[PDB]
Amino acid sequence: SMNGCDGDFKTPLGTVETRTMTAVLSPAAATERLISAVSELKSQPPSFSSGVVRLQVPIDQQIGAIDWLQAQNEIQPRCFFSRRSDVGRPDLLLRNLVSVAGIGSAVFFRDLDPFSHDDWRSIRRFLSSTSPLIRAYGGMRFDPNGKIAVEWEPFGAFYFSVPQVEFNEFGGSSMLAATIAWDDELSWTLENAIEALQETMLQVSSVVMKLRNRSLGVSVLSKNHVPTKGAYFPAVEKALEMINQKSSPLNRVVLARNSRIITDTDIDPIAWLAQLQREGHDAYQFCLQPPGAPAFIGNTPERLFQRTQLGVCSEALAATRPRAASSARDMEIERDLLTSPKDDLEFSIVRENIREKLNGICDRVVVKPQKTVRKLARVQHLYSQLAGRLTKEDDEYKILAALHPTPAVCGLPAEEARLLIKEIESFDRGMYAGPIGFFGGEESEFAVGIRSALVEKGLGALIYAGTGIVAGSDPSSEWNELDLKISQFTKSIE
Ligand SMILES: [Mg+2]
């Protein structure tokens, strides 16, 4: 492929365009038609020295993109993204893509230095408002300046890729597409790109079975936490002392834990993700797997931001407690969250911090509601949605730079929290708690990569969770909350 960060981002490509083929009825017909479309483009090619051409075949039936991905062999990078259903919540912003899977890379974007405005421009060079489905999928580290552990090395400070071949699932139809990207200046010619794509295209499977089998066929040989329970309790106690004493200004810090599971045979990360998705309720599913890397997968309820043209929306959370099996106990916990003066204060500092980040960029900011409880599968928490209108679509970068990370994964004051996290946690978060999603021409969306796992061949998996530590947090309750938060992974691996 080619690293678009190496490109001359101040010079536009020769073309960015999408060509749509005649619709077919089946995935097998789409695969054969796309092979022919690539061959036709090779025979009558664009003559620019750089460009992106997306070829897409509509499929007249609804097919799960995760089912397509499971049928593909290990052509990397592997990407998956499925946005939240957003059931019942209002759209503050006032053909919807249900899920997308990708294999290979038409162009990728990676550096060891933190994602910068120039890197964003490098990606924007390959996108266009008139090609709304040309999208770069990937994510960024929680802390791009932290020491990168071996398991996270392939991801760099950030990793994004436009797939070589992708499958799009819509409401009542689907699409198979291939993207040809090239830049002679980066020594990745149109000829190079078509040759690589034709080789991948002949490998693409159309045997898109609807996978429903819940057995993952692996045995867990051990489970160990970092920090251990014995080290976690003094860590939380250290944060509580900083909060309540007057030497430190700390008010909130998110402390995380890496739960390592060793398995006898390799976990299939796509099959695992598919199990979470079938149960996922109002959540983002994702997979990011650079070449030769472990697969970063997750099923997260939390949005960093969504942009549709000039509208951006985000959200705020704080004050988490369990769900309860009994309806009366569940309601009592929720009422305690909604009425507690202390929880109200702790939620407000998160909500108002995110609000003012948006307010510095957007003319108007709307908050709705000021405070509710969002009920997740195993926990519930105070919640608010926030939205604003940009003055121009190019302010997308400012939104991303302002929001990541929020106090929902870092803390307040941000710098005192960031250094406590550096000091207390012995493991690399990598892209856990970092933005994960996609850039597109007129639309971009990023989840927060919590509720996630790094799935490594010949090892097992690293499963991540964290909680917000504030005045009065109870270490035993917080530890239990970490267990609740990873249980979608630990229950399904059995
Ligand atoms: Mg908490």
PDB file of all heavy atoms in Angstrom, residues 378-402:
ATOM      1  N   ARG A 378     -25.130  -3.805  32.199  1.00  0.00           N
ATOM      2  CA  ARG A 378     -24.716  -4.193  33.535  1.00  0.00           C
ATOM      3  C   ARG A 378     -24.404  -3.033  34.467  1.00  0.00           C
ATOM      4  O   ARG A 378     -24.233  -3.270  35.669  1.00  0.00           O
ATOM      5  CB  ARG A 378     -23.499  -5.117  33.458  1.00  0.00           C
ATOM      6  CG  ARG A 378     -23.900  -6.512  32.987  1.00  0.00           C
ATOM      7  CD  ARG A 378     -22.698  -7.293  32.625  1.00  0.00           C
ATOM      8  NE  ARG A 378     -23.020  -8.628  32.128  1.00  0.00           N
ATOM      9  CZ  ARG A 378     -22.976  -8.974  30.845  1.00  0.00           C
ATOM     10  NH1 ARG A 378     -22.622  -8.083  29.925  1.00  0.00           N
ATOM     11  NH2 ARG A 378     -23.284 -10.214  30.484  1.00  0.00           N
ATOM     12  N   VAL A 379     -24.318  -1.802  33.962  1.00  0.00           N
ATOM     13  CA  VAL A 379     -24.130  -0.622  34.800  1.00  0.00           C
ATOM     14  C   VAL A 379     -25.083   0.463  34.313  1.00  0.00           C
ATOM     15  O   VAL A 379     -25.690   0.357  33.250  1.00  0.00           O
ATOM     16  CB  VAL A 379     -22.674  -0.106  34.776  1.00  0.00           C
ATOM     17  CG1 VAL A 379     -21.701  -1.169  35.288  1.00  0.00           C
ATOM     18  CG2 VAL A 379     -22.299   0.338  33.357  1.00  0.00           C
ATOM     19  N   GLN A 380     -25.211   1.521  35.115  1.00  0.00           N
ATOM     20  CA  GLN A 380     -25.981   2.691  34.723  1.00  0.00           C
ATOM     21  C   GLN A 380     -25.276   3.924  35.276  1.00  0.00           C
ATOM     22  O   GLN A 380     -24.522   3.839  36.249  1.00  0.00           O
ATOM     23  CB  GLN A 380     -27.441   2.621  35.211  1.00  0.00           C
ATOM     24  CG  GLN A 380     -27.598   2.439  36.709  1.00  0.00           C
ATOM     25  CD  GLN A 380     -29.021   2.059  37.085  1.00  0.00           C
ATOM     26  OE1 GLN A 380     -29.984   2.659  36.597  1.00  0.00           O
ATOM     27  NE2 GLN A 380     -29.162   1.042  37.927  1.00  0.00           N
ATOM     28  N   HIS A 381     -25.498   5.066  34.628  1.00  0.00           N
ATOM     29  CA  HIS A 381     -24.702   6.244  34.967  1.00  0.00           C
ATOM     30  C   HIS A 381     -25.424   7.516  34.551  1.00  0.00           C
ATOM     31  O   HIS A 381     -26.321   7.502  33.700  1.00  0.00           O
ATOM     32  CB  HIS A 381     -23.316   6.179  34.313  1.00  0.00           C
ATOM     33  CG  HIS A 381     -23.351   6.071  32.816  1.00  0.00           C
ATOM     34  ND1 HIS A 381     -23.515   7.167  31.995  1.00  0.00           N
ATOM     35  CD2 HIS A 381     -23.233   5.000  31.993  1.00  0.00           C
ATOM     36  CE1 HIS A 381     -23.490   6.778  30.731  1.00  0.00           C
ATOM     37  NE2 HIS A 381     -23.326   5.466  30.703  1.00  0.00           N
ATOM     38  N   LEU A 382     -25.004   8.632  35.146  1.00  0.00           N
ATOM     39  CA  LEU A 382     -25.567   9.900  34.727  1.00  0.00           C
ATOM     40  C   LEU A 382     -25.098  10.215  33.312  1.00  0.00           C
ATOM     41  O   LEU A 382     -24.013   9.805  32.891  1.00  0.00           O
ATOM     42  CB  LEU A 382     -25.176  11.008  35.695  1.00  0.00           C
ATOM     43  CG  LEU A 382     -25.857  10.882  37.072  1.00  0.00           C
ATOM     44  CD1 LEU A 382     -25.345  11.967  38.007  1.00  0.00           C
ATOM     45  CD2 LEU A 382     -27.365  10.979  36.928  1.00  0.00           C
ATOM     46  N   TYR A 383     -25.928  10.951  32.579  1.00  0.00           N
ATOM     47  CA  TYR A 383     -25.744  11.028  31.135  1.00  0.00           C
ATOM     48  C   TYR A 383     -26.358  12.309  30.598  1.00  0.00           C
ATOM     49  O   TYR A 383     -27.355  12.805  31.125  1.00  0.00           O
ATOM     50  CB  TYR A 383     -26.382   9.809  30.462  1.00  0.00           C
ATOM     51  CG  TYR A 383     -26.270   9.770  28.953  1.00  0.00           C
ATOM     52  CD1 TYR A 383     -25.051   9.506  28.330  1.00  0.00           C
ATOM     53  CD2 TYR A 383     -27.383   9.995  28.150  1.00  0.00           C
ATOM     54  CE1 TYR A 383     -24.953   9.456  26.930  1.00  0.00           C
ATOM     55  CE2 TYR A 383     -27.292   9.956  26.754  1.00  0.00           C
ATOM     56  CZ  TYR A 383     -26.079   9.687  26.156  1.00  0.00           C
ATOM     57  OH  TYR A 383     -26.002   9.656  24.773  1.00  0.00           O
ATOM     58  N   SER A 384     -25.748  12.828  29.536  1.00  0.00           N
ATOM     59  CA  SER A 384     -26.242  14.007  28.851  1.00  0.00           C
ATOM     60  C   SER A 384     -25.677  13.995  27.438  1.00  0.00           C
ATOM     61  O   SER A 384     -24.550  13.548  27.231  1.00  0.00           O
ATOM     62  CB  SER A 384     -25.831  15.289  29.592  1.00  0.00           C
ATOM     63  OG  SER A 384     -26.111  16.415  28.798  1.00  0.00           O
ATOM     64  N   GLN A 385     -26.471  14.465  26.480  1.00  0.00           N
ATOM     65  CA  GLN A 385     -26.035  14.651  25.103  1.00  0.00           C
ATOM     66  C   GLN A 385     -25.813  16.131  24.818  1.00  0.00           C
ATOM     67  O   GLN A 385     -26.522  16.995  25.339  1.00  0.00           O
ATOM     68  CB  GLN A 385     -27.065  14.106  24.120  1.00  0.00           C
ATOM     69  CG  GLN A 385     -27.101  12.606  24.035  1.00  0.00           C
ATOM     70  CD  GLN A 385     -27.841  12.144  22.808  1.00  0.00           C
ATOM     71  OE1 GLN A 385     -27.247  11.946  21.752  1.00  0.00           O
ATOM     72  NE2 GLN A 385     -29.150  11.995  22.930  1.00  0.00           N
ATOM     73  N   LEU A 386     -24.830  16.415  23.967  1.00  0.00           N
ATOM     74  CA  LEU A 386     -24.432  17.785  23.669  1.00  0.00           C
ATOM     75  C   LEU A 386     -24.210  17.920  22.173  1.00  0.00           C
ATOM     76  O   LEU A 386     -23.674  17.008  21.540  1.00  0.00           O
ATOM     77  CB  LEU A 386     -23.152  18.178  24.417  1.00  0.00           C
ATOM     78  CG  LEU A 386     -23.207  18.073  25.946  1.00  0.00           C
ATOM     79  CD1 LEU A 386     -22.794  16.696  26.434  1.00  0.00           C
ATOM     80  CD2 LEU A 386     -22.282  19.126  26.525  1.00  0.00           C
ATOM     81  N   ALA A 387     -24.627  19.049  21.611  1.00  0.00           N
ATOM     82  CA  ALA A 387     -24.514  19.223  20.168  1.00  0.00           C
ATOM     83  C   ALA A 387     -24.258  20.684  19.852  1.00  0.00           C
ATOM     84  O   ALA A 387     -24.634  21.583  20.605  1.00  0.00           O
ATOM     85  CB  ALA A 387     -25.768  18.744  19.438  1.00  0.00           C
ATOM     86  N   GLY A 388     -23.624  20.911  18.714  1.00  0.00           N
ATOM     87  CA  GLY A 388     -23.369  22.273  18.299  1.00  0.00           C
ATOM     88  C   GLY A 388     -23.175  22.309  16.805  1.00  0.00           C
ATOM     89  O   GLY A 388     -22.980  21.275  16.165  1.00  0.00           O
ATOM     90  N   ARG A 389     -23.255  23.506  16.244  1.00  0.00           N
ATOM     91  CA  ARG A 389     -23.080  23.671  14.809  1.00  0.00           C
ATOM     92  C   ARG A 389     -21.741  24.330  14.544  1.00  0.00           C
ATOM     93  O   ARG A 389     -21.409  25.358  15.150  1.00  0.00           O
ATOM     94  CB  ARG A 389     -24.222  24.483  14.192  1.00  0.00           C
ATOM     95  CG  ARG A 389     -24.132  24.759  12.709  1.00  0.00           C
ATOM     96  CD  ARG A 389     -24.723  26.095  12.459  1.00  0.00           C
ATOM     97  NE  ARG A 389     -24.106  26.883  11.384  1.00  0.00           N
ATOM     98  CZ  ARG A 389     -23.146  27.762  11.615  1.00  0.00           C
ATOM     99  NH1 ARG A 389     -22.778  27.945  12.823  1.00  0.00           N
ATOM    100  NH2 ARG A 389     -22.607  28.489  10.575  1.00  0.00           N
ATOM    101  N   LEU A 390     -20.975  23.726  13.643  1.00  0.00           N
ATOM    102  CA  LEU A 390     -19.684  24.264  13.254  1.00  0.00           C
ATOM    103  C   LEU A 390     -19.867  25.443  12.303  1.00  0.00           C
ATOM    104  O   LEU A 390     -20.859  25.533  11.578  1.00  0.00           O
ATOM    105  CB  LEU A 390     -18.837  23.188  12.569  1.00  0.00           C
ATOM    106  CG  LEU A 390     -18.593  21.867  13.311  1.00  0.00           C
ATOM    107  CD1 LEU A 390     -17.905  20.887  12.366  1.00  0.00           C
ATOM    108  CD2 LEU A 390     -17.752  22.082  14.558  1.00  0.00           C
ATOM    109  N   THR A 391     -18.885  26.340  12.295  1.00  0.00           N
ATOM    110  CA  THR A 391     -18.901  27.383  11.273  1.00  0.00           C
ATOM    111  C   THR A 391     -18.436  26.855   9.922  1.00  0.00           C
ATOM    112  O   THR A 391     -18.859  27.371   8.883  1.00  0.00           O
ATOM    113  CB  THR A 391     -18.044  28.574  11.705  1.00  0.00           C
ATOM    114  OG1 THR A 391     -16.659  28.224  11.631  1.00  0.00           O
ATOM    115  CG2 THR A 391     -18.378  28.958  13.116  1.00  0.00           C
ATOM    116  N   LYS A 392     -17.588  25.831   9.910  1.00  0.00           N
ATOM    117  CA  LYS A 392     -17.166  25.213   8.661  1.00  0.00           C
ATOM    118  C   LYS A 392     -16.785  23.763   8.925  1.00  0.00           C
ATOM    119  O   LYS A 392     -16.364  23.411  10.030  1.00  0.00           O
ATOM    120  CB  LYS A 392     -15.993  25.963   8.025  1.00  0.00           C
ATOM    121  CG  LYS A 392     -14.739  25.992   8.876  1.00  0.00           C
ATOM    122  CD  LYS A 392     -13.620  26.734   8.143  1.00  0.00           C
ATOM    123  CE  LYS A 392     -12.377  26.896   9.011  1.00  0.00           C
ATOM    124  NZ  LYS A 392     -12.655  27.620  10.287  1.00  0.00           N
ATOM    125  N   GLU A 393     -16.924  22.926   7.890  1.00  0.00           N
ATOM    126  CA  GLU A 393     -16.686  21.498   8.073  1.00  0.00           C
ATOM    127  C   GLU A 393     -15.239  21.215   8.445  1.00  0.00           C
ATOM    128  O   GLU A 393     -14.956  20.212   9.109  1.00  0.00           O
ATOM    129  CB  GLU A 393     -17.080  20.726   6.807  1.00  0.00           C
ATOM    130  CG  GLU A 393     -18.593  20.625   6.622  1.00  0.00           C
ATOM    131  CD  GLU A 393     -19.005  19.684   5.504  1.00  0.00           C
ATOM    132  OE1 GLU A 393     -18.507  18.531   5.462  1.00  0.00           O
ATOM    133  OE2 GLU A 393     -19.844  20.095   4.671  1.00  0.00           O
ATOM    134  N   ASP A 394     -14.315  22.096   8.051  1.00  0.00           N
ATOM    135  CA  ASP A 394     -12.908  21.895   8.370  1.00  0.00           C
ATOM    136  C   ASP A 394     -12.614  22.007   9.860  1.00  0.00           C
ATOM    137  O   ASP A 394     -11.552  21.559  10.303  1.00  0.00           O
ATOM    138  CB  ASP A 394     -12.049  22.890   7.598  1.00  0.00           C
ATOM    139  CG  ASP A 394     -11.736  22.416   6.201  1.00  0.00           C
ATOM    140  OD1 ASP A 394     -12.079  21.263   5.864  1.00  0.00           O
ATOM    141  OD2 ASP A 394     -11.143  23.200   5.437  1.00  0.00           O
ATOM    142  N   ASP A 395     -13.524  22.583  10.644  1.00  0.00           N
ATOM    143  CA  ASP A 395     -13.353  22.581  12.087  1.00  0.00           C
ATOM    144  C   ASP A 395     -13.509  21.192  12.700  1.00  0.00           C
ATOM    145  O   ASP A 395     -13.453  21.070  13.929  1.00  0.00           O
ATOM    146  CB  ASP A 395     -14.339  23.564  12.721  1.00  0.00           C
ATOM    147  CG  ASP A 395     -13.920  25.020  12.511  1.00  0.00           C
ATOM    148  OD1 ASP A 395     -12.744  25.253  12.164  1.00  0.00           O
ATOM    149  OD2 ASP A 395     -14.759  25.922  12.717  1.00  0.00           O
ATOM    150  N   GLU A 396     -13.701  20.153  11.878  1.00  0.00           N
ATOM    151  CA  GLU A 396     -13.740  18.783  12.382  1.00  0.00           C
ATOM    152  C   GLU A 396     -12.500  18.472  13.208  1.00  0.00           C
ATOM    153  O   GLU A 396     -12.599  17.885  14.290  1.00  0.00           O
ATOM    154  CB  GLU A 396     -13.860  17.798  11.211  1.00  0.00           C
ATOM    155  CG  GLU A 396     -13.821  16.313  11.610  1.00  0.00           C
ATOM    156  CD  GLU A 396     -13.880  15.398  10.402  1.00  0.00           C
ATOM    157  OE1 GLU A 396     -12.818  15.138   9.801  1.00  0.00           O
ATOM    158  OE2 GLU A 396     -14.993  14.970  10.035  1.00  0.00           O
ATOM    159  N   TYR A 397     -11.319  18.873  12.722  1.00  0.00           N
ATOM    160  CA  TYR A 397     -10.101  18.554  13.451  1.00  0.00           C
ATOM    161  C   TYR A 397     -10.102  19.208  14.821  1.00  0.00           C
ATOM    162  O   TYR A 397      -9.665  18.597  15.805  1.00  0.00           O
ATOM    163  CB  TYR A 397      -8.849  18.981  12.683  1.00  0.00           C
ATOM    164  CG  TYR A 397      -7.613  18.739  13.523  1.00  0.00           C
ATOM    165  CD1 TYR A 397      -7.064  17.472  13.622  1.00  0.00           C
ATOM    166  CD2 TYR A 397      -7.037  19.768  14.277  1.00  0.00           C
ATOM    167  CE1 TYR A 397      -5.955  17.234  14.405  1.00  0.00           C
ATOM    168  CE2 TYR A 397      -5.933  19.535  15.062  1.00  0.00           C
ATOM    169  CZ  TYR A 397      -5.400  18.271  15.124  1.00  0.00           C
ATOM    170  OH  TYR A 397      -4.304  18.024  15.909  1.00  0.00           O
ATOM    171  N   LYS A 398     -10.570  20.459  14.903  1.00  0.00           N
ATOM    172  CA  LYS A 398     -10.602  21.141  16.189  1.00  0.00           C
ATOM    173  C   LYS A 398     -11.468  20.388  17.191  1.00  0.00           C
ATOM    174  O   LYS A 398     -11.127  20.320  18.373  1.00  0.00           O
ATOM    175  CB  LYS A 398     -11.109  22.579  16.036  1.00  0.00           C
ATOM    176  CG  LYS A 398     -10.180  23.514  15.274  1.00  0.00           C
ATOM    177  CD  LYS A 398     -10.740  24.945  15.277  1.00  0.00           C
ATOM    178  CE  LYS A 398      -9.910  25.886  14.397  1.00  0.00           C
ATOM    179  NZ  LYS A 398     -10.755  26.947  13.754  1.00  0.00           N
ATOM    180  N   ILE A 399     -12.595  19.834  16.735  1.00  0.00           N
ATOM    181  CA  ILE A 399     -13.476  19.074  17.620  1.00  0.00           C
ATOM    182  C   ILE A 399     -12.742  17.859  18.176  1.00  0.00           C
ATOM    183  O   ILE A 399     -12.729  17.615  19.388  1.00  0.00           O
ATOM    184  CB  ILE A 399     -14.760  18.664  16.873  1.00  0.00           C
ATOM    185  CG1 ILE A 399     -15.604  19.896  16.523  1.00  0.00           C
ATOM    186  CG2 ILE A 399     -15.555  17.651  17.683  1.00  0.00           C
ATOM    187  CD1 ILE A 399     -16.229  20.604  17.741  1.00  0.00           C
ATOM    188  N   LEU A 400     -12.095  17.097  17.295  1.00  0.00           N
ATOM    189  CA  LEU A 400     -11.372  15.901  17.711  1.00  0.00           C
ATOM    190  C   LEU A 400     -10.247  16.242  18.686  1.00  0.00           C
ATOM    191  O   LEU A 400     -10.086  15.588  19.722  1.00  0.00           O
ATOM    192  CB  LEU A 400     -10.828  15.180  16.469  1.00  0.00           C
ATOM    193  CG  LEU A 400      -9.826  14.040  16.669  1.00  0.00           C
ATOM    194  CD1 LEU A 400     -10.508  12.813  17.298  1.00  0.00           C
ATOM    195  CD2 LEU A 400      -9.193  13.664  15.322  1.00  0.00           C
ATOM    196  N   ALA A 401      -9.466  17.284  18.371  1.00  0.00           N
ATOM    197  CA  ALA A 401      -8.360  17.699  19.228  1.00  0.00           C
ATOM    198  C   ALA A 401      -8.846  18.223  20.576  1.00  0.00           C
ATOM    199  O   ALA A 401      -8.184  18.003  21.595  1.00  0.00           O
ATOM    200  CB  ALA A 401      -7.531  18.782  18.525  1.00  0.00           C
ATOM    201  N   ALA A 402      -9.984  18.919  20.601  1.00  0.00           N
ATOM    202  CA  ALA A 402     -10.514  19.432  21.864  1.00  0.00           C
ATOM    203  C   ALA A 402     -11.074  18.316  22.743  1.00  0.00           C
ATOM    204  O   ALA A 402     -10.898  18.332  23.970  1.00  0.00           O
ATOM    205  CB  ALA A 402     -11.596  20.476  21.590  1.00  0.00           C
TER     206      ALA A 402
END
